[PDB]
Swiss-Prot record:
Oligomeric and partner information: Binds to the intracellular domain of tumor necrosis factor type 1 receptor. Binds to RB1. Interacts with SRC. Interacts with SDHA.
Residue numbers bearing the Phosphothreonine modification: 104
Family in the record: Belongs to the heat shock protein 90 family.
List of residues that carry N6-acetyllysine: 192
Name by which UniProt lists this protein: Heat shock protein 75 kDa, mitochondrial
Amino acid sequence: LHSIISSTESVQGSTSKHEFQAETKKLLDIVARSLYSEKEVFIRELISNASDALEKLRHKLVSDGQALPEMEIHLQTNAEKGTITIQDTGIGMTQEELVSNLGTIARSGSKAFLDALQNQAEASSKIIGQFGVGFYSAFMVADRVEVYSRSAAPGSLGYQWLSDGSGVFEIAEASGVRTGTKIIIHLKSDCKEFSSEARVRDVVTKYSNFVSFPLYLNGRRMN
Ligand SMILES: COc1cc(C(F)(F)F)ccc1Cn1ncc2c(Cl)nc(N)nc21
């Protein structure tokens, strides 16, 4: 087995409170309405984000003239705790991205996204992934979401990011955060299936060969 996910991060800073941007809640809701019928697709959306983060790290390291480190995507199910967890060893998120990225689209304009979603030229899941709101799909299956991230940028601190998706999110400095990003999803009552290894394996194996970095599920290689 090869696992990197462990509950070892520790809160080491006081909590700063932030309220959702105006049109953030509306986008959360529309992503949920759009993907309910195939709600298992949140896993693919998050794997895609992880893959993107690893590509961003690659380009940083190429310009830095440095070797590629362990570049991996990990899934972990906990049936007892009713969670699914995804962790990647990519570029991570800065403090300002953790504070601002949730409301990025709406502020920058959601019209292009909403128009594309309406046209249905591609799968709704692809449109959502492409316009950079795949993280929104975490909330549609979650009672609450727990993020740990630390950017590869020099001087970046590690952070814990918490939200129930209701209108507020909380950020605190954390120790023991590995460069990259871990998302812990505490699953909704109708979404418990995704805390089952068998179920998640059945979902992921349908596209795991399309993932360009080593993909692990509960310590087992999927590709
Ligand atoms: C936790 O991923 C996110 C959190 C938030 C926020 F709301 F917590 F800020 C907004 C957007 C995203 C998606 N996202 N953005 C950068 C990024 C990187 Cl570097 N890695 C991964 N795996 N996902 C990413």
